[PDB]
Paper text:
GPR20 is a class-A orphan G protein-coupled receptor (GPCR) and a potential therapeutic target for gastrointestinal stromal tumors (GIST) owing to its differentially high expression. GPR20 constitutively activates Gi proteins in the absence of any known ligand, but it remains obscure how this high basal activity is achieved. These structures reveal a uniquely folded N-terminal α-helix (cap) of GPR20 that might be essential in conferring the receptor’s constitutive activity.
To understand how Ab046 binds and whether it affects the structure and function of GPR20, we also solved the structure of Gi-coupled GPR20 complexed with Fab046. This structure was determined to a global resolution of 3.22 Å with the density maps sufficiently clear to place part of Fab046 (VL and VH of Fab046) into the GPR20-Gi-Fab046 complex. The overall structures of the GPR20-Gi-Fab046 complex and GPR20-Gi complex are nearly identical with root mean square deviation (RMSD) values of 0.71 Å for the whole GPR20-Gi complex and 0.70 Å for the receptor alone, which is consistent with our BRET results that Ab046 is a non-functional antibody for GPR20. In both GPR20-Fab046 and GPR20-Gi-Fab046 structures, the antibody fragment stabilizes the complex through an antibody binding interface composed of CDR2 and CDR3 of Fab046 heavy chain and the extracellular side of GPR20 mainly consisting of the N-terminal cap, extracellular side of TM1 and ECL1 of GPR20, which is consistent with the previous epitope mapping study that Ab046 mainly binds to the N-terminal domain and ECL1 of GPR20. The interface is maintained by seven pairs of hydrogen bonds between Fab046 and GPR20: side chain of N71CDR2 with E43N-term, S74CDR2 forming two hydrogen bonds with E43N-term, backbone carbonyl of S74CDR2 with R40N-term, backbone carbonyl of G121CDR3 with R117ECL1, the main-chain carbonyl oxygen of F122CDR3 with Y114ECL1, backbone carbonyl of F122CDR3 with H46N-term; and one π-π interaction: F122CDR3 with Y114ECL1. Structural comparison of GPR20-Gi-Fab046 with active and inactive β2 adrenergic receptor (β2AR) (PDB: 3SN630 and 2RH131, respectively) reveals an outward movement of TM6 in the G protein-coupled GPR20 relative to inactive β2AR.
Numbering used by the authors:
A (entry chain C): 7 to 63
B (entry chain B): 3 to 340
C (entry chain R): 32 to 188, 196 to 311
D (entry chain E): 288 to 392
E (entry chain S): 2 to 121, 124 to 235
F (entry chain A): 3 to 54, 182 to 232, 240 to 354
G (entry chain F): 19 to 140
Amino acid sequence: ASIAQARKLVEQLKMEANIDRIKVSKAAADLMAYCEAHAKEDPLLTPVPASENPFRE
Amino acid sequence: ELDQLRQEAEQLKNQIRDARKACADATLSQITNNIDPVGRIQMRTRRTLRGHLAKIYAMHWGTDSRLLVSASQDGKLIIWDSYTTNKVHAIPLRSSWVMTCAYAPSGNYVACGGLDNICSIYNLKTREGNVRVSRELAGHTGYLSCCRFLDDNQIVTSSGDTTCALWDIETGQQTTTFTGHTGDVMSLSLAPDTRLFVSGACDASAKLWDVREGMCRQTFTGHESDINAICFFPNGNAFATGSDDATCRLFDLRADQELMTYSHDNIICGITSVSFSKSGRLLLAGYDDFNCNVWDALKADRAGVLAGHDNRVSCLGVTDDGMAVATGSWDSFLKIWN
Amino acid sequence: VPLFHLFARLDEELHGTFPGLWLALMAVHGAIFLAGLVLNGLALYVFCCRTRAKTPSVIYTINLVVTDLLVGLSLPTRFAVYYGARGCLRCAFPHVLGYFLNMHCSILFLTCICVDRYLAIVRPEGSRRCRQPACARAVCAFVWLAAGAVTLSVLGVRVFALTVLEFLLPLLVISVFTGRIMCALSRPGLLHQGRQRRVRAMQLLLTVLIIFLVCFTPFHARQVAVALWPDMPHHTSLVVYHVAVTLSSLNSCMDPIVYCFVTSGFQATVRGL
Amino acid sequence: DTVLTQSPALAVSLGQRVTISCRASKSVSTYIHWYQQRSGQQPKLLIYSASNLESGVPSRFSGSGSGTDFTLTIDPVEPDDIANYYCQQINELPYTFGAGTKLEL
Amino acid sequence: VQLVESGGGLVQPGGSRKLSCSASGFAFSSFGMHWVRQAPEKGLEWVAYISSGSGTIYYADTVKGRFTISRDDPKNTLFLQMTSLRSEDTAMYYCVRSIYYYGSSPFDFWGQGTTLTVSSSDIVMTQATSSVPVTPGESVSISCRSSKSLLHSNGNTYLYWFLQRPGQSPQLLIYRMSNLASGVPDRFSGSGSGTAFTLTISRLEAEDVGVYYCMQHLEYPLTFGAGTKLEL
Amino acid sequence: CTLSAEDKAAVERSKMIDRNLREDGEKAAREVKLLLLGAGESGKNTIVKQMKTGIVETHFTFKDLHFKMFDVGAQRSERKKWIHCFEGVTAIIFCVALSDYDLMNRMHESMKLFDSICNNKWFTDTSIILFLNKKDLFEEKIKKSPLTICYPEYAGSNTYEEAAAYIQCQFEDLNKRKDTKEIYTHFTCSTDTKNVQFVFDAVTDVIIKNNLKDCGLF
Amino acid sequence: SQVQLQQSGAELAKPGSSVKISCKASGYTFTSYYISWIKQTTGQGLKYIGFINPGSGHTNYNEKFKGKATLTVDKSSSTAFMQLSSLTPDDSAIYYCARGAGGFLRIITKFDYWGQGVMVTV
């Protein structure tokens, strides 16, 4: 009836249980490093002057 | 034995949860408490593209960050030039029930889809001078939610029959069928390297799939209701799911768990669109309460409200160069904010 | 002698002949202020920001009620001028120029509201003036600038022209369009399920014609009954005019009751908030 | 038309209070003026609204009464007080003066 | 996609004639149309233009007054009615399609054209060279000089390059300063700045023989370029 | 000015596009849209058969009115996710089989679907043109089978004159928005030519009622 | 200057003629006070003739004298003109003009200051 769905679910789960993981501190550090590295070029974050902004209303 | 398989599944789930809680040594809030906040960001409606006669359900920016396509229930796919206001093409759809669109990275083709369960691919650069239906991909047993272009030959779609599908356009057949969702897939977003992609569904979960291998790679839970929008971080190692319980949750890929939740007590509606800025500091979220909210990635305090729409914002789009954002709502007007 | 010279003369002519009547009309005008300031303000508040719909009828009623508000505010202005600044006849022009927004610019506004109802219910036009608030703004500006072309006239330094052009003609086109709507809403073949709002529409459209034949008819009937038939004394000429200005200003209190307050679609906004 | 009737000439003595009544046809409430007119001179104003005085006139003469019949009391008489006294109805537009009274020694 | 012309022939001066463009294979109603003449020994010269839907219309000052133009979208034809012909109208009249949107390539297809013979404040663009004998395999640079700077505030300098092979209709090579036209090889290129413009060919072969024309489009294309002839 | 020639021509093309789009909208603005919503293939196919994948659109015309009926019942997905696309439809054509009363009970499942559709966020003023299906099968199946099988509370006889009237009456009782909706009910006959006539009759009353609301009479 | 109402001098009259009487006001704004006319006779008391607003021009007369007397006002010199036609021997009287203040509960309240009197004998 549904033994095939059950077996594919459990093999997918034990595939999901054997993936290498890194610590959340390192991941947060990497996210902060990427955000602070590209923060200088961001017309959304730091507003560029209206001379080089193509949307002039 | 079904009970033995259920016991194995619950043991694997417990092991995954224990591994996730063992990996959780420091939350994002403690790490990013030291940095200064963004501050109040006040945006201006630089443009207002008017000319639709129904509710806009999706839009997408071209790779040149100037042209944008837009789809609404009147059956018109309009390709606006955003630096000016003037349109370029106004494609009449065969079926007016459209709830997705995409601009190809090459800019040659456009796509649309919806309640007709058919992804229509239109060719813009043609010798006859009029936009023609280059292809009509069919084989989805449910409404299309969000189809995105991999390249000029391959397109990934997400349908309402709990599946995603990578199609080769010239052959027209489903090259790969991604399945494993217990619920309708509602939104789609590929990685910047265009090798892996995430899909969020109505089963309160998102899934990492590998588009080359053809099988699900990761599964993230932690939502209380349906996920209506999902967008990769520009790094490619994180994404953010906007759900129906007023929560935008940021997941990261190498941690296999949540990182932050953007919950506010003053909002009770759902989220219809989620997008990032170019550097990933900001997080625009087009909500169901007629205005978008601009949150912070590493922090959680909001930085602004993009009020100005007479109905619910249904689609968000941030250009590849990060020059400006654009919101399309259920009133017939798109708006570029900067 | 200009007509508004005669109006300013008649304003204080009954003072002394019928002083108790003058204070009675003082009280009636004050009551019309009391019942037409807050009512018009509430209608504007529930009709400008409380409604998110843009169709000709809403904007038509918005401009109708702002002229209602202006004529209401100018109502205890002639009396304040005549009680604090006695004299100052050509000096006090707005006290008579409150007739710009009553027996002028509030008759054409009802007229264009009625033709809007005819154009939207039975639709004997096809494009219905292409709909949109743009044509509504165009017609509103048309009537605003056409009331000036007849208010500047007549009272220039002509009486029967105002009655024949600005009262008989708008009433003829109002009564010929209301009569057409009654036939269209009573055609045989309509479902016997909606005959509760299709008969309230009949009642709410015949009512506004009766209010027109009560508020605005006695002033214009008198204004042609003095020049044509001069066999009537100054005593009757003076009490009829002074009593048929409050009836003309009674339309100010009766304007948002029939056009803004009985509308069950927008009535629940006031009663729900 | 309210015809106003006045008291006739009344003999008075020096240093004595005097009072003269003026009657009206219909109710006037408090709407009658009182005037004096000297022998061969312009008639000047004495009482306005039958109860008030103006322009710093002496308080030796004052009106009284409400409704229809009014009075004025002068106390005492003076050498320049021998004058013709008059009442103006004002409530109805055609105003009417009184008959007149004369004061003699 | 194909355009053909009907009319022309021999005509007496001071008479009248009609020229017809029949277009088959593309959406004619969404394309603006141009008529461009060429003398039997001189280069191409602009004559007239009519937009899509006939909203706007423009004529050359040399013919403004005696020539009229029209389009028939349901019958997909283009009419040029010419009256009061003089001795300067002996020319072959190419009929050109051109569609204007963002990123479009105007003047992409030129018609065949029919010869017409009779009996007897412009941005002038100058070409220095007129006959450059270059063998195949070398590099050919062709320079064009205008009267004013063609760069606009939009950022795109409106100049076009055309190639006419000996015998048939010209083709669009470079549109809007080095945006490559579809169908031409990648050997061609464009460059320049301000009023000075160059076309570059890295490798040329035998069939790349012809006369190269410039074009302005800042104002309306009332001007052309006296073409430079390449020969072996 | 400060516009190049190509920019002016692009603005002209955009104006032409806007004019054509407005013409197309005004063309497809006087038509009537009717979301047809059956319940487990009750009579919807028969309904679209007697007139004239995913969604199915049926276009027909009757007495100078273009109708566009969207048979959407072939979706089989989460109805809460795509039902907001039909907000603004003129009416909703339901379809309940009267013969399905004795078949847990399919008639009762029709009642749950009508409860979720009549009492909806989006459909707060879209009137339902309810269609009671085949009565001939109901007439023959009521002589022996009582109405008490589907209805525990029914103090009436087995005559279909009052038995069918009960079903229509209680179906109208599921409305919670009686002041804004109007459930028009019709008893469809197979050979009846008044099926499309009643749809046209109910649409004209809805159009009039929507016209009175805009003018302010209602 | 104090408020004053100067009048014309004594005039002679004959039956079947016409007469004019002029009043000029000083010391106050003329258009803010009504100007009234009264008749004073030797036999009877005084009879109120009428009044008129200098600015509005609203004229009111007594019913006995309606049409007999005509009232005009010129505001250039602040002059009130009273015109009598068809003079009668019983019309030999003294005409006075008075300043009136516009009240609230009535049209006029105070007839404060009068003129010196214009005597006309027919």
